[PDB]
Amino acid sequence: FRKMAFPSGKVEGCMVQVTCGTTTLNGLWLDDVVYCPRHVICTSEDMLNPNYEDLLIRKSNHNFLVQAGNVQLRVIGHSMQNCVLKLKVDTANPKTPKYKFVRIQPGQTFSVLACYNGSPSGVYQCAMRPNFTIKGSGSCGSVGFNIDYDCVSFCYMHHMELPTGVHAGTDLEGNFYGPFVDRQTAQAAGTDTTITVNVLAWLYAAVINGDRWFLNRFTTTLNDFNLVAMKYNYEPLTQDHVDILGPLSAQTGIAVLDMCASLKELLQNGMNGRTILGSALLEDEFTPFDVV
Amino acid sequence: FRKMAFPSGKVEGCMVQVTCGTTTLNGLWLDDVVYCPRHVICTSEDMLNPNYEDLLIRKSNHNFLVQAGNVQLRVIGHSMQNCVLKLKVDTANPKTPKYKFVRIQPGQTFSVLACYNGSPSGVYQCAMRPNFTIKGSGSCGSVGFNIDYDCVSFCYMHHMELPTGVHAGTDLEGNFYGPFVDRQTAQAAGTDTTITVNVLAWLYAAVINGDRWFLNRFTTTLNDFNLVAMKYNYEPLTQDHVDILGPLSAQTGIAVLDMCASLKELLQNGMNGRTILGSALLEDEFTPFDVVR
Numbered sequence: 146f147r148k149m150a151f152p153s154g155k156v157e158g159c160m161v162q163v164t165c166g167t168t169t170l171n172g173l174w175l176d177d178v179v180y181c182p183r184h185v186i187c188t189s190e191d192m193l194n195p196n197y198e199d200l201l202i203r204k205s206n207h208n209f210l211v212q213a214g215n216v217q218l219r220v221i222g223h224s225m226q227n228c229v230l231k232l233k234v235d236t237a238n239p240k241t242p243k244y245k246f247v248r249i250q251p252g253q254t255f256s257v258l259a260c261y262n263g264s265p266s267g268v269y270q271c272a273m274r275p276n277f278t279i280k281g282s283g284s285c286g287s288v289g290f291n292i293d294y295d296c297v298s299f300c301y302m303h304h305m306e307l308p309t310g311v312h313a314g315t316d317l318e319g320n321f322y323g324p325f326v327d328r329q330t331a332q333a334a335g336t337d338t339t340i341t342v343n344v345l346a347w348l349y350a351a352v353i354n355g356d357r358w359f360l361n362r363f364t365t366t367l368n369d370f371n372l373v374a375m376k377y378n379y380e381p382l383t384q385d386h387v388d389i390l391g392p393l394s395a396q397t398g399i400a401v402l403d404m405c406a407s408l409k410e411l412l413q414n415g416m417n418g419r420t421i422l423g424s425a426l427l428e429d430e431f432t433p434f435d436v437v
Numbered sequence: 438f439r440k441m442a443f444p445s446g447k448v449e450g451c452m453v454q455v456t457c458g459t460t461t462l463n464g465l466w467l468d469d470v471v472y473c474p475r476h477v478i479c480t481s482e483d484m485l486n487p488n489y490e491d492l493l494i495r496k497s498n499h500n501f502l503v504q505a506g507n508v509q510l511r512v513i514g515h516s517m518q519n520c521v522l523k524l525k526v527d528t529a530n531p532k533t534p535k536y537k538f539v540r541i542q543p544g545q546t547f548s549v550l551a552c553y554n555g556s557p558s559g560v561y562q563c564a565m566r567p568n569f570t571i572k573g574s575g576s577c578g579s580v581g582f583n584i585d586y587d588c589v590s591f592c593y594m595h596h597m598e599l600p601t602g603v604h605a606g607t608d609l610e611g612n613f614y615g616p617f618v619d620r621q622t623a624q625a626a627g628t629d630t631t632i633t634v635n636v637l638a639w640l641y642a643a644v645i646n647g648d649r650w651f652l653n654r655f656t657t658t659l660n661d662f663n664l665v666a667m668k669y670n671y672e673p674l675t676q677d678h679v680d681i682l683g684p685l686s687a688q689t690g691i692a693v694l695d696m697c698a699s700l701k702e703l704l705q706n707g708m709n710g711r712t713i714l715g716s717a718l719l720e721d722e723f724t725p726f727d728v729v730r
Contacts, residue, residue, distance in 0.1 A: 146574065147561045147572075147573060147574040148561065149551065149558075149559030149560060149561045149574060150442055150559065150560050150561070151559065151560070152445045152446070152449050152550060152557040152558070152559065152560055153444045153445050153446060153560065154444070154445060154446025154447075154449040154450065154557075155446075157444050157446040158446065258444060259441065265444045266441075266444070267439075267441030267442060267443060267444065268441065268442050268443070268444055268445065268560060269439045269440070269441045269442065280439075280715070281439055282438055282439040282441065354602075423572070424718075425718075426717045426718070
């Protein structure tokens with residue numbers, strides 16, 4: 146059961162390199178706008194406490210250099226939307242896919258096209274952590290996305306590396322995920338928790354595959370499970386979570402609070418050297434949708 | 438440290454659907470040739486004892502329906518090279534990247550673009566296991582590749598699922614990896630082993646990152662290392678492997694056999710609740726080449 150990323154070609158055709166002063170990072174070119182982190186207009190000195198409103202009024206179009214591979218794109222206007230800079234350019238991207246800007250929730254998954262100075266280098270599948278960071282792997286301005294039948298839903302743009310080595314960023318409308326700011330200040334990820342509904346989805350995946358040994362005869366209650374969950378650093382499970390797992394309960398004949406009893410037992414006794422779909426640690430970066 | 442796949446766009450533009458009879462699977466459209474598994478010409482019955490030469494002589498060009506998106510491609514010739522069918526079409530793929538065909542060895546990594554009826558649906562990063570199978574995820578004719586400086590090295594095409602759930606396939610000259618055949622027999626993957634040289638390159642990546650809780654003050658001989666490691670189903674480490682890790686030893690000041698000693702202790706002790714880039718497992722699908730980059 147591999148973690149799979151979406152095919153990245155539709156996004157690859159949108160990556161460009163944006164340079165302002167000595168700073169170069171990645172930008173997203175859709176029709177005649179290039180989107181990138183606003184902190185590209187920031188000198189290392191400004192990043193300690195910048196006034197973005199005033200730093201950009203002092204900038205003009207000639208301060209921005211946009212490169213789509215070989216071709217330089219001419220900037221003809223610039224604007225900010227929250228923490229994303231919007232550079233209007235004189236050429237519409239002919240490779241623009243059908244797309245939407247969406248904002249995702251903690252625990253949802255997406256693919257990231259990691260890029261270096263407008264040159265895409267690799268693609269990987271993530272989950273947005275409950276503490277709103279991304280455990281991932283210069284790359285600023287790289288984006289996250291899902292694809293639904295020819296439509297690319299952009300959900301993430303990379304802005305910052307946090308001192309624990311995780312990543313922080315915004316949606317494509319410049320709204321941060323998590324209590325972070327685009328400033329060179331002290332900031333840290335909160336204590337993270339495991340995404341319970343994803344673990345349950347992944348256990349249903351093991352039952353759809355031929356692995357049943359963690360199933361037991363018992364049930365538990367939503368409240369009783371949550372007390373075990375909170376004691377083991379796990380997101381609390383909601384009646385909505387139970388509802389999303391409904392399809393996998395109908396398919397496998399394992400009710401959700403039955404699977405919850407299984408998980409509760411695994412959290413207290415381990416696997417005794419057994420494995421679930423190959424692994425011996427519990428996977429939480431597959432959503433119920435991903436498993437279906 | 439994420440296991441990353443190559444950006445798949447250059448390969449997406451080469452995926453097509455090949456239909457023969459009631460069988461549809463994926464093909465690879467490069468210049469004016471479509472490559473696909475030759476068992477596309479087999480019925481379910483034929484797969485027990487397929488005589489491919491006999492099955493193929495009875496086909497004409499128009500028995501093969503090739504679809505590239507909305508466009509039907511006209512097949513104008515066909516031939517068989519080992520276990521891959523090569524369909525000559527009347528149109529060169531305008532999206533053909535710079536490419537070559539390479540055959541890989543166990544331990545080598547690559548990306549797989551998993552496709553269904555010519556439609557790419559996901560990309561994942563792979564290693565060829567020592568037993569010549571893939572622990573991967575209607576996929577037949579999906580391909581594995583590496584990308585180096587805008588040139589796509591195709592190394593794998595998917596043909597068969599083995600009863601344990603793993604995958605068997607060929608290079609792009611149609612030669613199977615391992616002892617497997619495109620026939621429904623009792624073949625099974627041999628006991629798999631861990632790719633030792635990849636674990637060590639990864640441990641070197643951990644030290645370079647700044648992680649070294651797992652080091653110790655011991656060394657080992659190469660032979661003592663292998664005697665112990667093979668008790669955990671680890672591949673033997675060769676002098677070639679030692680030579681390969683040389684640049685990482687030089688960069689971290691940690692001799693290869695000293696890292697070998699650490700691995701021996703890691704196998705004996707486990708992780709004790711700790712992690713190594715991240716990670717809760719001894720990871721063996723990053724090559725030394727991968728680690729430098």
